[PDB]
Each structure stands twice: as structure tokens, then as C-alpha cells.
Amino acid sequence: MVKLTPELINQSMQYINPVRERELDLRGYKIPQIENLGATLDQFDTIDLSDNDLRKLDNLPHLPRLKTLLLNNNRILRISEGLEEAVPNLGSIILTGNNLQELSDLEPLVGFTKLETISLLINPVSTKPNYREYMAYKFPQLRLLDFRKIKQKDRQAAQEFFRTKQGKDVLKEIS
Amino acid sequence: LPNQTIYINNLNEKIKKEELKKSLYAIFSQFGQILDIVALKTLKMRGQAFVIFKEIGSASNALRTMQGFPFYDKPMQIAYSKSDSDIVAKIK
């Protein structure tokens, strides 16, 4: 295991990826905490932290260029609030294979204004009742959830559902 | 016959190829480093893609795990690529 250090960043692969974006590969190091990302000097469109040991998505510095965060196969159970102040242009967050449990644990993501793609595959939250409906309602800008589109009819249905008294009670208990 | 490249069929042709590639990268990134993705708007590659992993073991895990996954509402049909010459013939 190693910690996320400037030395690690400097030795790691930094390259143009198959979708033509600048990517930093930090995969497989069992990194236990996000830190020292300021040392990237905002060079990257995408940071790949797959296969580490993160328990929290937190401690991001100002990185206006960052658009994709790959977080596959960590142990994440908590997301810190206000991360949109650090990475306001985040477009995709891939949290496949983590430990996010409840819909309320996703509330810290609501502030992202251009977050269009989320994966919560192989997290307990993605099998909770009303998951897709709640995501459509709570994240109106979201386009792709677990690699299935949120369609226009899906948007409308979710909005109409949560307008009803029964829908409002569902929301109340989700909190 | 396992090799580093998976071949996918039954992909949703209504999805723009740039978006398709970005989403394929995201969903397959859990298995390993991806060296390239091939998904062209041609008849020969209609509804199809190749995802090239750095490691064969990653390709094997991706094939086993994602078989039949409903990607853009269609179950993926995944196999190992037949040969590098087949890949070349497909993109020509």
C-alpha cells in the first residue's frame, strides 16, 4: 500500500485516454485517503482512483479542469458536502463497487450543476426502493444512471409521482 | 483463446458513437486499464464495439461479469475477439 503523495503522482501514468482526455492513473495502490491532489496542478480531465482503499470521497482541492472521477472498487461509504466548490465541472462520477447504503447518502452530490452521468452499480443504494425515480427527481440534470438513460417520460413520471401525497410520504421517509 | 480484446454485439445503434465510447469506457473501467475502444458508425460495425484491455485477465473478468448487462436498455452480447486480423477486417 502507498499513500497519495506528490511522488506517486509524478511517477504515475499521465496520458491522453481513449476518449481523448488527459488522465492520471492512480489505480491499484490501496490508497486510503484522498490527499495531495493539488500537486496535479489541474492538469487532468480525468483522475482514475479505481482499486484503492478509500472510505470517503472528500478533500478535493480546486480543480476546474476535472470532468470525470473514476472510483471503481473502493470502500466508499460517505461523500463530503460542498465538493462542487472544488470540482464544479464534474460531469461523470463512477462509483461502481462501493459501499454507499441509503438514498440520503447521495445528497452531497445534488450541488453539482453539470453532473450528467452517475454509476452506483454494486452499491447497496442502487437496489433500494424508488431508486431510479428518486434520482430523476433529486438530480434533474442527470442523463445517465447506471448506464440506462433517464428518459423524458421518466423525468415527467418522477415529477408527477413526487407531487402526489403518496409520493411526498415516500420522500419524507427517504430522509 | 482468451485475449486482451472483448467484442460486444447488440449495442444500441441510436446512441451517438462519441457518447457510446465514453459510456463503454466508464462501465468497463472497473475491470482494468483500457488501451482503446473501437465503435464506428459503419454497417460492418453496426451495433458492435471492441474494448481493448491492457491485460488478458481484465478482459476475462469483463466478459464474465458484464455478459447480458442492459446497457442503454439492450443486453450486451460479449465474446473474446476472434483474432487481431478479424478486428482489422472489421474496421476496414
| Burial of B16: CB neighbours in 10 Å, binned 0-12, 13-18, 19+ | exposed
Tell which residue, B61, B32, B66, has the closest CA to residue B49.
Answer: B66
Kindly state the helix (H) or strand (E) to which residue A93 belongs, with its residue range. Answer: strand A92-94
Alpha helices (H) along B1-92: 17-28, 56-66, 84-91
Residue B27's nearest CA partner among A150, A145, A57, A116 is A145
A94 grid coordinates: 463512477
In contact, A69 and A37? CB cutoff 8 Å:
no
Least CA distance to A51: which residue of chain B? B30
How many helices (H) and strands (E) chain B has is answered by 3, 6
Residue A13 to residues A3, A8, A23, A73, A163, Cα–Cα distance (Å): 16, 10, 8, 19, 49
DSSP B24: H
User: At residue B47, what are phi and psi to the nearest 5 degrees?
Assistant: 65, 15
**CA B13 – CA A94 distance, rounded (Å):** 23
Question: Taking a C-beta distance cutoff of 8 angstroms, is the pair A136, A146 a contact?
Answer: no
The Cα A125–Cα A140 span in angstroms is 19
The runs of H, that is alpha helices, within chain A are: 6-11, 131-138, 152-163, 165-174
Strands A148-149 and A144-145: antiparallel
Exposed (0-12), middle (13-18) or buried (19+): which is B64, by Cβ within 10 Å? exposed
The domains located in chain A, with CATH, are 1-175 (3.80.10.10)
Q: Which amino acid is at B23?
A: S
Decide if B49 contacts B71 (C-beta within 8 A).
Answer: no
Cell numbers placing A26? 492512480
Angle at A12 between CA A9 and CA A16, to 5 degrees: 110
CB atoms within 10 A of CB A8: 16
- The set of cell numbers assigned to B63 is 466478459
Q: How far apart are CA A158 and CA B11, in angstroms?
A: 27
Q: Domains in chain B, start-ordered, CATH in brackets?
A: 1-92 (3.30.70.330)
Rounded to 5°, the CA angle A38-A41-A45 comes to 100
Sign of CA dihedral A112, A53, A56, A124: positive
Which of A97, A154, A160 shows the shortest CA–CA distance to A131?
A154
Q: Is B77 helix (H, G, I), strand (E, B) or coil?
A: strand
By CB atoms closer than 10 A (0-12, 13-18, 19+), residue A124 is middle
Interface size A-B, in CB pairs within 8 Å, comes to: 49
Residues of A with CB under 8 A from a CB of B: 17-19, 25, 27, 48, 50, 68, 70, 72-73, 92, 94, 96-97, 117, 119, 144, 147-149
Nearest-Å Rg of the Cα atoms of chain A is 17
